[PDB]
Design a protein around this ligand. Sequence first.
Ligand SMILES: C#CCNC(=O)N1CCN(C(=O)c2ccco2)CC1
Length: 121
Amino acid sequence: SYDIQAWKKQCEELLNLIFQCEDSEPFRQPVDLLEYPDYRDIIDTPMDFATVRETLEAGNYESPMELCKDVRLIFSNSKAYTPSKRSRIYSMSLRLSAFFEEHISSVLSDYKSALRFHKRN
Ligand SMILES: C#CCNC(=O)N1CCN(C(=O)c2ccco2)CC1
């Protein structure tokens, strides 16, 4: 239970689950500026689940906290871009965020516990 490296496969499996959710489809790829011409006026740092998966598989996350910051940026971008808090795509983002936070909590707890055990003495 003190495996320092276990978070990585746990996050690969959670991303697989997110890619099976219909609620993820708007968040799997970048925004087309012909469809949303003002998107980059509002959003300084775009983020999507394909970018998160590629960053993970490249070995360019050091911890699950860093992955969690990028996933949370997908959801804050949707809340900043939405013209209404009842919109279809924003409503999908809130359900997907609740599912992600329910599943990532044990991944973060186990990782932090494992590093504390590594430094115990
Ligand atoms: C697949 C794919 C391409 N995604 C895409 O076009 N969008 C996702 C991001 N976005 C929003 O979060 C949002 C909130 C309210 C309306 O859109 C704009 C639309």
